[PDB]
RNA sequence: UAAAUUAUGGUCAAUUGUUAGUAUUCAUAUUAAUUUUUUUAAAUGUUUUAUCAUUUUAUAAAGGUUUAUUUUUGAAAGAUUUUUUGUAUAAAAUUUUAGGAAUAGUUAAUAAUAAUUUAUAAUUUUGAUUAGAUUGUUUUGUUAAUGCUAUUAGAUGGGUGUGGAAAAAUAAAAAAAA
């Protein structure tokens, strides 16, 4: 069940690419013009361009150039977090990029939430940070997550994250915050300089 | 190992011997050019195509086949691979390094090897172009390589030749010397056919002299 | 298995007998040791020819020699008086 | 196994994968022009659930 | 061929063969027992192969020695006849 | 060649073995050299239906219209995490959850500690690419108390079958360098109390009674009647 | 086997030649290639005297002879000094510094490693400084015996090599004589006064009980890749002989 | 190593190699059927004569009465005869020196002839395939074990030179006094 | 496309390299035709091999066939020298004087301490061996190289009187180097090849005149005909021509 | 320029057609074969594996060749191990047609030359080159016999050139890693 004799030797160990026979017979006139038309259809170049001499995959430079020139969704970012999503995609989602984000970047992204849409975007970015990049969390990531959820009004997301934080990867959950979020305590943190017990709806008692 | 030292000792004592009228030229024949098989195979100066059961008198070698190893970046379909080429020159017994360089640049017969000035080195030590092989004690088994002007920075991608697989080749670049020989445009006959090997030919890692698994 | 089998084999009287198909190989050389019925150089069959003829490879070649001493005149009495029949002697 | 490997048109039935080559494989000559760019001014509209929960928060 | 048990690991892949090449630990153990019987026969087979080679080598040595003796006698006779004929010539 | 199994006997085609020698049979192809392998298809066949409980948002789908409720997004993240973990665990997933990327820890597979087999790897370094489940790892492979002198790149660092037990003492900070484990034979003097050998070069485990009974039942020497 | 001359393809075109092995100092594979040679050289120096390995001071060579004499030169110094006309690079790569783990643990803890590059970029000086005395014994006649680092305390080793060269470029093959140490024999030697303390025994003690048996064997529960004898893999996939089967699941 | 494999008649390790002894015979009416033990390569072309290292001999798979022998009252000697003509020297040369292979039918025929042990194919359904245990094998090995010197001597006699020269032959061969 | 796909001239395989390193480890690249160029084409002629002990000390005397200045070869080489000087003026020091041309039959080193007794025996042997041979005729044509092109000489093809000449020179070697001990550069049982030296690079001139005579100087005259010359005298001479402007006379036999 | 004999040796040579003045092997016999009385298919799923791959699986008829078809041990056999030793592409001879004349990227030297080197080049009436015919040097039939008359299956250009070797695009009487 070896294709080394069915196809040219240069295209061995090729998986995922569909119809390698197209690249085997690409030297024909009609196949060559079809390939040229397809590359022009994908665009990104001015001259009539074709695939290299013997390659069943697109060149890395051409693929990266087309990826960068690709029109991106969300043209108009309203909030600073909306702009931060664009710049994060620019830096840590470039084609063939070896860079990996940091929990400092995650905290900066999460601290810019103002709208519930901003909260949804930040939560999705956190989830992809922990699933795709698999980045270990810091001590205060859950603190900033709780602050964001409280100041955006999402109690249920905080409770859902608390109930099974271990699948979420939150290796540090404070006893004060767990008691507050499990319906046993009315406050979760105190301001050092202000000496008041957050949230404000609880501060209305102590004052 | 043992052959070189015993041959040197035998030659030394043969030179030291004084009671010898000399070998008979008629009795000692030379190598023949005609023999069976459709291949012209050259052997050592002490070997003959015919069966010679007697060991002839040792002789001083007046023509050493110096073999110089050049780097060569052949174009494989997967990518550029750096390999080794050997250029063999026939230099006299007392040829200086200057004439050795002349011989190697006249017998390289490769467009890429002699592109720029280079210096001959042995085991990493450069050779002085003023003294001859007598000072260095160079024999036919000596391993000599060459270092070019820009081989000390070949690790840089800019110095490395740019393959069309990962790098973009411009309209000005297709008019350059190597990239004109290479053809990025797949012709119907595919005139520039090169050696091809799969990306997974050596596995997940490249070729190495050690084990990484 | 080998030890039990050889111990069993050594206990049988019918064994320890020569087995020509096993203890030796008769002739390993390709060519035979004597011609047998193959056509002669003249084209004659084996039945029409006998060995030892001119086609066989050649056998090859002051005083008195060593074979002169044993020869004696029949007039002189024989060394050993074997009673030969007169008819056979003639 | 044999049913899965039959349709790949293996002459010797050697458990190989040789997908058939269609006459029209690329979309451009299959009959479609450039891929339609999505309406950005429509996809940028905030979703109805988002508006509802925004109003709920404002409550 | 190589036997593939029904109770083996099912490759949950539609793009390839429906069964894997692995096996149950019991299957590995029972395979070793079967392979042990294969070694019992082949070891006798290999030993018989070597002794047959030795016998053939010895027979070749003896027969070749005899043939060399006879051939040398014949060629000496031929050369003697040739030199006698040369003297007569 | 190098490893003529049962000598050069060629009684059957299977007498030579499935593979003739550990070295590649053809000089051209180096990859065909004999090496330990694990089932790639089974280990990478991650559970697909387990993600059918809740929808998953695509990375390139960033438009506002396709955004979902944050609770649903968190549910999707949990589903993706459990989907990754369902088939098993790889050292790239254990390293981020262990301090100092788990340097100096002992990693072993499930089949590496079953039966007389006993092998593990002492982690020395891990390089992470963009993906958190990909990259490379290097360490010292230890087999029955004998360890490699130089670090080697681990094989199959991506397949979800790895296990590791976290110990703080063996953790090595980035300031230091992971030390190779001592060899039970040469480096540290042998002691049965500290370590006892499970299999020696001429050892082979006795036949278990359950396997013996199953083989006899299969061969039919033992009586068997259907219920 | 490979015993054929090239006649199928022209000599000018290298059609199936193996790639030449090249070591780059921008990659950790350089440390991978060089570290075991370093530890072997240190062991040889500690066991037997080695010429040209001890360095009183940094060698001074003119520029013209710099590429002629420096390459292949390896020695050691007592002080932590660096040659001039070299830009310094510190090893901040954990993968790069991982390869010196055996040297640090078994032989001598390494304090730092630095790569020095000249202004002309035609050389590489690997300078590795070890802090602390050698863990292994040092003979009084050895080269390291003249080094004050053994018995500041840290001592460094300098190695010069041309960049972008085959692994044979460094002349570390000659430093492989396996001179043994006399650590156990020195105890019984005449100079040491433990000869009377040591008590030899000629007869083995009598055995009263058999050795404790191995624990109960449990067959593996996971699936198996197959027999190693047939698959031609080494017992544990690491070392051993294919014919001699051991250390596997059975 | 072919683009389209001849699926009907495949082989192993390609052609041409591993000479193997088989039993070739044209498919005719059974009453006129007779095979030919012969050594040939693993791969054969349309005509078998292309790859024919040596010819071993005919075999007639027809039990026949011994008409050549006189009518004897011996019961065993009056059983049917299955005549087979085989070569010994060439068979030994190809088996040992060249290390050829054999198929099951020639192996069974040679086992009947006494040249080879019984083939793995022929087995009695009455006796099942046994199993082995390391402890019992070690116990038997300790119970009986041959001496290393004698085992080395017998191995040398079986494998290396066996026709040795004793002191009587050496004394006979040694030169006579006049040339001493 | 011009001819055969693989020319016969390019099917060269080198056995000086290891067997298994040319296929994969490396590829040797060189022009192998230069070393296989035949001696006939390159002008090399196999001179008698001198033993190491006799190859150190410089020669003292040499046998030559004395010829009158009027002989045809002298003017043929004169015209050759004229052509060479007209074509290139830098080979004049390499070219020898036309009056210093002789046909050498043997070279030897007589020590100066005991030269007086040896020269009498040599001259009497020459007289007694040439008292019977009639004057010889030799046809000179062709060019050759000795000492790796250091010495350029006119070849002497076999012809009439050449067999008598070689028999006479063998007898001379037997009667000079055989019975009495004199250092002959070659072997007494070997025959010296006669030649007349037209060009030669001195060891002192080796510093600036290159290492060998380039072949283009005499390529056109490599097979030139220099004609038939009759020799009727022999002379044992010494390397001293400057003082008298002629060959030094040490022994002479009017053949 | 002498006979034979210690006597058949050394192992089978044997011809058959009833015509038709004569000349010349030519109607009708015998053997061998074809022909009537209805004898007479070339099978469809090769297999294993580490899974979108890799490993093993090398001469069927197609194309019309007479100065012509020639080569490997690098896979396998193959063995304590490492290691080692060698090759080989080239030849020679036999070559058809009733009425018989020119043939050509061409010969040699040189060389890892020359679409553009040097030379009085090479093939052929001792039958060439194109064209027609036919798969080449162990096969039959007939006869007492130097003859006459038959024979088969398969090597038909390259063009990312994998492989040890292209023989690589349906065609078994080939058991192909338990
Ligand atoms: Mg024709």
Automatic annotation (TrEMBL), chain A:
A GO cellular component annotation in the UniProt record: mitochondrial small ribosomal subunit
Top-level taxon of the source organism: Eukaryota
Protein name in the entry: Uncharacterized protein
Provenance organism: Trypanosoma brucei brucei (strain 927/4 GUTat10.1)
TrEMBL record, chain D:
Subcellular location: Mitochondrion
Highest taxon of source: Eukaryota
Family: Belongs to the mitochondrion-specific ribosomal protein mS41 family.
Organism: Trypanosoma brucei brucei (strain 927/4 GUTat10.1)
Lineage: Eukaryota, Discoba, Euglenozoa, Kinetoplastea, Metakinetoplastina
Entry protein name: Small ribosomal subunit protein mS41
Range covered out of full length: 126 to 184 of 187
Automatic annotation (TrEMBL), chain H:
Naturally occurring in which organism (per UniProt): Trypanosoma brucei brucei (strain 927/4 GUTat10.1)
GO cellular component term of the entry, any: cytoplasm
Protein name stated in the entry: Uncharacterized protein
Automatic annotation (TrEMBL), chain I:
Lineage: Eukaryota, Discoba, Euglenozoa, Kinetoplastea, Metakinetoplastina
Gene Ontology terms: cellular component: cytoplasm; cytosol
Name this polypeptide is given: A-kinase anchor protein 7-like phosphoesterase domain-containing protein
SUPFAM superfamilies to which the protein is assigned, alphabetical: LigT-like
GO molecular function: protein kinase A regulatory subunit binding
Organism domain of life: Eukaryota
Cited Pfam families: AKAP7_NLS (PF10469)
A-kinase anchor protein 7-like phosphoesterase domain mapped to chain residues: 59-255
């Amino acid at each position: 069940a070896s294709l080394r004799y069915r196809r040219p030797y240069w295209m061995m160990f090729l998986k995922g690419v569909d119809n390698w026979k197209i690249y085997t017979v690409i030297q024909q006139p009609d196949h060559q013009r079809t390939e040229m038309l397809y590359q022009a259809w994908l665009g990104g170049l001015d001259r009539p361009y074709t695939r290299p001499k013997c390659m069943a995959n697109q060149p890395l430079w051409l693929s990266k150039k087309r990826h960068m020139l690709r029109k991106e969704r969300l043209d108009g970012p309203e909030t600073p977090l909306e702009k931060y999503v664009l710049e994060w995609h620019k830096k840590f989602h470039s084609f063939q990029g070896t860079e990996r984000p940091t929990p400092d970047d995650l905290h900066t992204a999460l601290d810019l939430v103002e709208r519930p849409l901003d909260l949804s975007y930040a939560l999705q970015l956190l989830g992809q940070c922990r699933n795709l990049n698999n980045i270990r969390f810091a001590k205060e990531t859950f603190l900033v997550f709780l602050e964001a959820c409280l100041r955006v009004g999402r109690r249920d997301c905080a409770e859902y994250a608390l109930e099974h934080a271990e699948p979420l990867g939150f290796w540090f959950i404070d006893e004060d915050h767990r008691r507050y979020l499990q319906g046993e305590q009315t406050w979760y943190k105190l301001s050092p300089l202000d000496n008041l017990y957050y949230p404000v709806e609880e501060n209305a008692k102590l004052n | 190992g043992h052959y070189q030292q015993e041959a040197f000792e035998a030659r030394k004592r043969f030179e030291e011997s004084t009671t010898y009228p000399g070998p008979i030229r008629a009795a000692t024949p030379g190598d023949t050019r005609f023999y069976s098989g459709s291949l012209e195979s050259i052997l050592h100066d002490t070997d003959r195509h015919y069966w010679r059961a007697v060991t002839d008198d040792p002789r001083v070698q007046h023509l050493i086949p110096l073999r110089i190893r050049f780097k060569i970046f052949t174009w494989v379909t997967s990518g550029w691979e750096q390999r080794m080429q050997v250029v063999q020159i026939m230099a006299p017994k007392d040829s200086t390094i200057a004439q050795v360089k002349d011989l190697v640049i006249v017998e390289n017969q490769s467009p890429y090897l002699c592109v720029s000035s280079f210096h001959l080195a042995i085991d990493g030590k450069e050779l002085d172009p003023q003294k001859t092989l007598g000072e260095y004690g160079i024999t036919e088994q000596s391993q000599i390589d060459a270092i070019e002007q820009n081989d000390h920075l070949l690790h840089r991608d800019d110095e490395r030749p740019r393959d069309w697989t990962v790098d973009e080749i411009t309209a000005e670049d297709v008019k350059r010397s190597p990239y004109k020989e290479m053809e990025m445009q797949p012709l119907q006959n595919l005139a520039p056919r090169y050696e091809a090997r799969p990306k997974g030919y050596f596995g997940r890692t490249y070729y190495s002299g050690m084990k990484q698994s | 298995f080998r030890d039990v089998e050889e111990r069993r084999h050594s206990r049988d009287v019918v064994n320890e007998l020569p087995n020509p198909w096993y203890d030796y190989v008769a002739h390993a050389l390709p060519f035979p040791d004597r011609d047998a019925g193959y056509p002669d150089e003249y084209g004659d069959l084996g039945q029409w020819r006998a060995p030892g003829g001119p086609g066989s490879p050649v056998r090859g070649p002051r005083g008195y020699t060593a074979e002169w001493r044993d020869l004696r005149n029949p007039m002189r009495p024989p060394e050993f008086p074997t009673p030969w029949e007169r008819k056979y002697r003639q | 196994e044999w049913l899965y490997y039959k349709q790949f048109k293996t002459v010797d039935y050697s458990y190989r994968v040789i997908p058939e080559l269609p006459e029209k494989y690329r979309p451009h000559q299959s009959g479609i022009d450039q891929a339609p760019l999505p309406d950005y001014r429509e996809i940028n509209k905030m979703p109805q659930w988002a508006e509802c929960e925004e109003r709920r928060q404002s409550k | 061929r190589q036997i593939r048990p029904y109770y083996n690991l099912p490759s949950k892949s539609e793009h390839g063969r429906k069964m894997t090449g692995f096996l149950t630990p019991y299957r590995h153990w029972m395979w070793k027992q079967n392979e042990l019987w294969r070694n019992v026969h082949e070891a006798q087979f290999e030993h018989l192969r070597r002794v047959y080679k030795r016998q053939w080598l010895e027979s070749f040595r003896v027969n070749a020695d005899e043939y060399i003796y006879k051939y040398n006698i014949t060629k000496a006779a031929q050369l003697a006849q040739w030199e006698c004929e040369m003297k007569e010539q | 060649r190098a490893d003529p199994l049962n000598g050069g006997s060629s009684m059957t085609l299977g007498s030579k073995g499935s593979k003739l020698s550990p070295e590649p049979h053809r000089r051209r192809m180096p990859w065909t050299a004999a090496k330990e392998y694990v089932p790639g298809v089974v280990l990478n066949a991650r559970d697909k239906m387990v993600l059918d409980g809740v929808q998953l948002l695509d990375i390139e789908s960033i438009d506002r219209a396709s955004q979902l409720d944050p609770l649903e997004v968190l549910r999707a993240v949990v589903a993706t995490r459990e989907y990754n973990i369902s088939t098993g665990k790889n050292i790239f997933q254990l390293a981020s959850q262990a301090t100092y990327n788990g340097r100096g820890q002992r990693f072993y597979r499930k089949e590496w500690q079953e039966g007389t087999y006993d092998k593990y790897v002492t982690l020395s370094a891990i390089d992470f690419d963009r993906d958190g489940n990909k990259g490379t790892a290097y360490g010292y492979i230890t087999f029955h108390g004998e360890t490699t002198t130089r670090p080697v790149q681990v094989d199959f660092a991506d397949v979800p079958g790895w296990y590791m037990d976290f110990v703080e003492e063996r953790a090595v900070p980035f300031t230091g360098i992971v030390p190779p484990p001592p060899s039970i034979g040469t480096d540290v003097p042998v002691d049965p109390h500290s370590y006892r050998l499970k299999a020696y070069p001429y050892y082979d485990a006795p036949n278990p009674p359950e396997f013996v009974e199953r083989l006899l039942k299969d061969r039919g020497v033992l009586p068997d009647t259907p219920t | 086997r490979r015993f054929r001359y090239n006649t199928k393809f022209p000599a000018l075109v290298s059609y199936n030649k193996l790639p030449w092995e090249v070591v780059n100092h921008e990659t950790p594979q350089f440390h991978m290639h060089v570290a075991p040679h370093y530890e072997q050289l240190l062991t040889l120096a500690a066991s037997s005297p080695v010429p040209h390995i001890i360095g009183s001071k940094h060698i001074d060579v003119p520029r013209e002879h710099r590429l002629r004499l420096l390459p292949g030169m390896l020695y050691l110094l007592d002080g932590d000094t660096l040659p001039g006309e070299f830009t310094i690079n510190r090893v901040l790569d954990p993968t790069a510094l991982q390869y010196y783990g055996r040297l640090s643990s078994q032989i001598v803890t390494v304090e730092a490693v630095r790569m020095l590059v000249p202004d002309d970029l035609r050389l590489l000086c690997n300078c590795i400084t070890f802090k602390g005395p050698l863990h292994l014994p040092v003979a009084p006649y050895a080269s390291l015996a003249s080094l004050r680092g053994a018995s500041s305390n840290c001592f460094t080793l300098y190695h010069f090599v041309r960049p972008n060269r085959p692994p044979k470029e460094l002349q570390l093959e000659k430093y492989y004589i396996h001179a043994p140490c006399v650590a156990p024999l020195s105890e019984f030697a005449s100079n040491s006064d433990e000869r009377g303390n040591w008590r030899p025994r000629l007869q083995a003690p009598k055995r009263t009980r058999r050795a404790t048996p191995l624990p109960a064997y449990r067959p593996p529960q996971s699936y198996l890749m197959g027999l190693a004898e047939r698959l031609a893999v080494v017992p544990g996939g690491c070392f051993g002989r294919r014919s001699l089967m051991w250390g596997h699941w059975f | 190593a072919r683009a389209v494999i001849k699926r009907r008649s495949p082989q192993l390790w390609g052609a041409p190699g591993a000479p193997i002894i088989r039993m070739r015979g044209h498919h005719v009416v059974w009453k006129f059927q007779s095979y030919d033990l012969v050594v040939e390569h693993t791969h054969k072309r349309r005509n078998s004569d292309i790859r024919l290292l040596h010819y071993l001999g005919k075999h007639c798979p027809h039990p026949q009465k011994s008409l050549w022998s006189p009518d004897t009252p011996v019961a065993q000697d009056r059983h049917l005869f299955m005549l087979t003509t085989v070569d010994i020297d060439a068979f030994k040369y190809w088996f040992g020196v060249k290390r050829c292979r054999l198929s099951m039918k020639p192996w069974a025929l040679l086992a009947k002839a006494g040249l080879l042990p019984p083939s793995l194919t022929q087995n009695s359904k009455i006796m099942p395939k046994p199993l082995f245990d390391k402890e019992s094998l070690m116990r038997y090995y300790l119970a009986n074990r041959k001496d290393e010197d004698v085992m080395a001597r017998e191995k040398y006699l079986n494998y290396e030179n066996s026709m040795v020269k004793t002191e009587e032959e050496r004394a006979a061969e040694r030169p006579v006094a006049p040339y001493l | 496309e011009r001819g055969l796909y693989f020319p016969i001239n390019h099917r060269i395989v080198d056995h000086r390299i290891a067997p298994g390193v040319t296929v994969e480890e490396t590829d040797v690249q060189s022009r192998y035709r230069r070393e296989l160029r035949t001696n006939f084409a390159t002008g090399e002629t196999r001179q008698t091999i001198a033993p190491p002990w006799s190859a150190r000390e410089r020669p003292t005397h040499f046998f030559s066939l004395r010829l009158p200045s009027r002989n045809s070869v002298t003017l043929r080489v004169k015209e050759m020298h004229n052509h060479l000087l007209f074509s290139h003026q830098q080979c004049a020091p390499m070219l020898v004087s036309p009056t210093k041309l002789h046909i050498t039959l043997g070279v030897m080193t007589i020590p100066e301490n005991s030269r007086e007794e040896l020269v009498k025996n040599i001259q009497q042997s020459m007289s007694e061996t040439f008292a019977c041979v009639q004057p010889l005729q030799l046809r000179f044509r062709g060019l050759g190289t000795f000492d790796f092109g250091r010495v350029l000489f006119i070849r002497v093809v076999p012809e009439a009187d050449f067999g008598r000449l070689e028999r006479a020179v063998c007898d001379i070697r037997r009667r000079v180097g055989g019975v009495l001990g004199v250092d002959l550069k070659g072997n007494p049982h070997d025959s010296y090849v006669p030649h007349v030296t037209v060009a030669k690079i001195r060891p002192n001139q080796r510093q600036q005149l290159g290492d060998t005579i380039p072949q283009s100087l005499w390529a056109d005259y490599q097979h030139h005909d220099f004609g038939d010359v009759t020799l009727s005298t022999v002379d044992l001479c010494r390397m001293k021509g400057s003082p008298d402007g002629y060959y030094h006379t040490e022994g002479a036999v009017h053949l």
